[PDB]
Write a structure and sequence with these properties.
The structure is a homohexamer. In chain A, helix 5 packs parallel to helix 6. In chain A, the strands form two sheets. In chain A, strands 5-4-6-7-3-8-9-10-11 form a nine-stranded mixed sheet, sandwiched between helices. Chain A starts with 6 loop residues before the first strand and ends with a strand. Chain A has one domain: Rossmann fold (3-Layer(aba) Sandwich), CATH 3.40.50. Chain A is an alpha/beta fold and about 220 residues long. Chain A has seven helices and eleven strands. The interface between B and C is medium-sized, with 24 and 21 residues. The structure holds phosphothiophosphoric acid-adenylate ester (6 copies), chloride ion (6 copies) and magnesium ion (6 copies). The PDB classes it as transferase. The entry lists the keywords Serine/threonine-protein kinase, transferase. It forms a hexameric assembly.
Chain lengths: ~220, ~210, ~220, ~220, ~220, ~220
């Protein structure tokens, strides 16, 4: 009678151990952090590994970084996203305003079905934020997408995200930190919450190298 | 003394000196992922399973289907209890007066003794919260109400008034010590009765909340 | 033509800390975070007034029902129901559906029951003036009054709006401080205009006989 | 020839005239700021009372909250009979407290002329607070009164007063503190600034007793 | 293709900790409290580009006059008026006596005029974030490699002033001037470089007669 | 001449010319910021007084709250006879203080300019919405520079180790920044002076202790 909720493996080294199997399938995981913490990298590695390891197609939704820079930056880690877009295994949805929510979603829906995507990454007034963020989560759940949603925060040990509500609306919450002490920076990942399932607790150190994120349950 | 109802949440009835005061409202406040919803659910589930006391769960964001799914993680089959008419999940998710009349109706219909209510001006909140607590008191329900807070050692709840309108106040914390998280539960206040003081560690496992007093 | 006199609370240790009790004919502000003992102090004040001196009391509640006030005092062995049945205690229910209307009601009750002790439980610019009015009008009636107020930090503002301590003649702070994982309650008399008192924090506990304070003296 | 540029009048408050190197600058206003129950009213009353008793200098006490009756009653704590001084026309308590600014200044002026007062105690947005306070100070100076002005603050170490402008407009600033440390309170007085002369600096301990304020200047 | 390439600053110590210099074709935010060396860094970027690589530079100023930028550069033995006269450098005076699109076309007009490869820009949140993004995107489409300075008011607080600048920039450098025990210590940090690697944390530096010197310590 | 790095004018304030390696940058404004009673007015008077006495460089003092009479009176604390200097036409105190019973900075700047011309002054002291503050200070600084004045500008702050001035913009619009502190350490006060920045030239770093004496500011060696 003890039924566990299903998880999808990220294959990001060390993360699937911390999360006891990966990300809860069919739900959204908030990945929050200050600048340069690895939010986009995590969200890319999620889709890249799904395609390469499991032939699970992905939709990356971007709101500021252009598709070409995303693909360009992913070359830092030896990943050819251009090739995956050419094969129709990756779709980069450009939702970044040229130099509204209902429309964005059916766009994502259309892209999910067109590419048969199972994995989605979305990168990146409190009252309106909470309620508009809930319905975004709500709709993705109905599609059956497993989704990484990045958010920004401005303090390493302050609120989880910018408006103090995002962490309460999300099913799952991951926090990327880049803590400065004694003039040195230390990267850590923490799974704060996974509704309805177990996970390791606290911060785990990680590095970003030529092969992406490396977490040490170490 | 004052009559209490057993939560049967491991360790909690020892800390509260016998359980939660019957007919009164208990605030359960914590940061994200502290175990608020779990405490709420466990409170109703145990009431039903061990004492045949029916319950009403009121949810303002989480869907009933997710509540049920997330609870099967603990081997608790809530759909069964709903089917047997012993649990009712009130979906107020995605008008305070109408809500209260809806809660009231659900209590009468299912004959509930236990209620869990899960999750802007400073004293519209106080006024409206006081209203809700006041009416549940008249009905005679014993209520667990959860609230969010954003800091482990800061205000009790979001608006700085919630703990003053509640009869009882429980704080769930999830504190960083170095790079590790330690969960604790504290009964800050129980009106009209004694209780253990300060913080007590707990874990969440496959069997729910497990608190270690003494 | 002499320094203000005091009325004994008979709350163990408090009359030592205050050097004789609460200043007569004035209000004393009693401030604290949730569950610090504010209502208890303000009940014990009235209860001891009745039991020890046959001084009738009026309790003004704004949220807690009279029945709850009574039920909650049973854990101390205080039979408030009987005191209310005897006409010695009047619990004024001021829980809402203009404090000018409240004042006359209080005055009304104060005169029928011949009360000498009162407890009131419980825009910054407006707060200050409204509190000032209340203190002043209670002073005119001649009532010795405890009024509780809320605060949200143990070692921060005296009260909520940062003005209450400045309008009040007398100020008591109840604290409930974390020491390790344990809690420590303390009572402090911050100020009493026109008279002397002990300084700093004194530990207390809440027991089956109410507030129990320890000055080492 | 005491080699300091600003003439001072003695408060005769024990230890304060040492710390201030002679007392309060004559014809100027001194801000006295403190948290609740720090002694601000006591200091401003003791200033007037001593002026009267020691030098027969009449004094005006302006109160915005406490009633005259309570001011008088509370001074009895220190053995001071202010009603007697009011009856003798040596003390005037100006009641500006609210019923249970340009015109207030004229009342003050009228009282000062009527009672020949030498000492004044006034007891007790930022854009307009500054200019109104500046106005009040300047007018008392024009009259030639020597003024104690009390203000509130909410932290022992933090803003001098409430609006972050009071200490910049005043010529002199005194801070009363009531510091809680290790569950014990200790009172101190500091003269932060006195334009035009030296003064002792830092915090000095004091007590409030049956004789009023007692300050201990050390060195 | 392959990873983003870098442009050498020739600022001693910087090209080592950035592993090659500034990412080409992109903007780098250089944030710092007052007198941290922000203008000096953005000047040295252009100056070295001109002197070492004959890469012309455009310096955009919003407050300091060109005359003062030139005067202050004499502190380091650099003759900016000569470089301006030769057509190697252009100091674009956008200082008042804001339309961002007009400013952008002036920058574009200068870059085409002087064939510049390097640009230094010195110096609600919804508004700020949007405009900065447009400025950054435009410089990217032009091909400029850009240093943009910003102000911050705390050494270990927000990266810039509006809480958004560090999130729309591709690259972020933080200059600090930390006061500890009555002494100041200058440090430089590369916080992030999108799509490429760099050393982490604070590195001490000094400003002397020959500009910025960063020490790998 | 102007092919050279910026030149400095000596303050002759004890120790200050050492810390600043020559004095205040000529032709520019220096912000002098501090909490209450830190010695801002004293620094800005001593700057002018020394200019007149040591170099026969006339000074203009612009006061926005303290009356000229009080400024002169209080300066006697330091042995300085400012009335004598006013009388000889070497010092001019411009009273910009408000009547005891919006502000036009353009008009005031023009009144400052005439005084500078009339008294042929080389040294000026000015005592004492963020966007509006920034723009207005910018125009004042810019105009003084055009006039060629070397200027001390005082500002208030409310924390010893918090913001440099009140509005978080003053220290960015100013060419030079000096911070006067009055730090409470264990019930004692310690006065320190720091030159935070001087655009275009070098200076010593961090805090230097000073005292105010019957001869004014006295900054102790490092
Ligand atoms: N089977 C399990 N074993 C161990 N831990 C579990 C298990 N199931 C859930 N948890 C933990 O319980 C947490 C969820 O507790 P909740 O009661 O949903 O918290 P919450 O305080 O209500 O959070 P919100 O409403 O999302 S802010 C998860 O983050 C896990 O840490
Ligand atoms: N018999 C008892 N023995 C020990 N402690 C008791 C007993 N009865 C009550 N208490 C304690 O007293 C507290 C209630 O104190 P109150 O005076 O009601 O506090 P309060 O400061 O008025 O809080 P509010 O109004 O709810 S914010 C409870 O939280 C218990 O800790
Ligand atoms: N005889 C006395 N012996 C010792 N202390 C006394 C005596 N009389 C009064 N006090 C003390 O003096 C304090 C009153 O000081 P005040 O001058 O009224 O303070 P205040 O700073 O004006 O405070 P406000 O106006 O109420 S915020 C009381 O709180 C007592 O601590
Ligand atoms: N002869 C002296 N010897 C020692 N200290 C003195 C002497 N004369 C004045 N002072 C000190 O100088 C201080 C005043 O310095 P100012 O220059 O007026 O300060 P300020 O920073 O301008 O303060 P404001 O404008 O009133 S906020 C006084 O508070 C005294 O501490
Ligand atoms: N090959 C590499 N080796 C080491 N670190 C690298 C490499 N490539 C990129 N990085 C690091 O990855 C960081 C960028 O990670 P991102 O995922 O872009 O961060 P981000 O959290 O999304 O930041 P934003 O969107 O700009 S706020 C850079 O700042 C580098 O520190
Ligand atoms: N020859 C030099 N030797 C040493 N330090 C110097 C020299 N010339 C200038 N400096 C220093 O350089 C600092 C100025 O650096 P800038 O680049 O102008 O700083 P900034 O961060 O742009 O400051 P702003 O724009 O005024 S907030 C001065 O405050 C001096 O400390
Ligand atoms: Cl790393
Ligand atoms: Cl756990
Ligand atoms: Cl206790
Ligand atoms: Cl004392
Ligand atoms: Cl340096
Ligand atoms: Cl000194
Ligand atoms: Mg990113
Ligand atoms: Mg929950
Ligand atoms: Mg209470
Ligand atoms: Mg007072
Ligand atoms: Mg600059
Ligand atoms: Mg001054």
């Amino acid at each position: 009678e003890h039924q566990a909720i299903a998880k999808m493996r990220t294959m990001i080294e060390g993360f699937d151990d911390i999360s006891h199997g990966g990300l809860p399938i069919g739900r959204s995981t908030l990945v929050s952090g200050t600048s340069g913490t690895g939010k986009t990298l995590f969200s890319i590695q999620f889709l890249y590994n799904g395609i390469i390891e499991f032939d699970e197609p992905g939709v990356f939704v971007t709101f500021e970084e252009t598709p070409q820079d995303i693909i360009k930056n992913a070359r830092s880690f030896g990943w050819d996203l251009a090739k995956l877009v050419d094969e129709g295994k990756l779709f980069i949805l450009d939702a970044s305003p040229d130099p509204d929510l209902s429309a964005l979603i059916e766009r994502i829906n259309y892209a999910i079905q067109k590419y048969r995507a199972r994995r989605v990454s979305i990168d990146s007034a409190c009252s309106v934020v909470r309620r508009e963020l809930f319905r975004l989560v709500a709709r993705l759940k109905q599609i059956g997408a497993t989704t990484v949603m990045t958010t920004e925060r401005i303090e390493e040990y302050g609120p989880i995200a910018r408006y103090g509500v995002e962490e309460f609306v999300s099913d799952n919450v991951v926090i990327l930190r880049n803590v400065l002490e004694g003039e040195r920076r230390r990267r850590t990942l923490e799974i704060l919450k996974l509704r309805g399932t177990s996970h390791m607790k606290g911060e785990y150190p990680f590095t970003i190298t030529d092969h992406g994120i490396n977490i040490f349950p170490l």
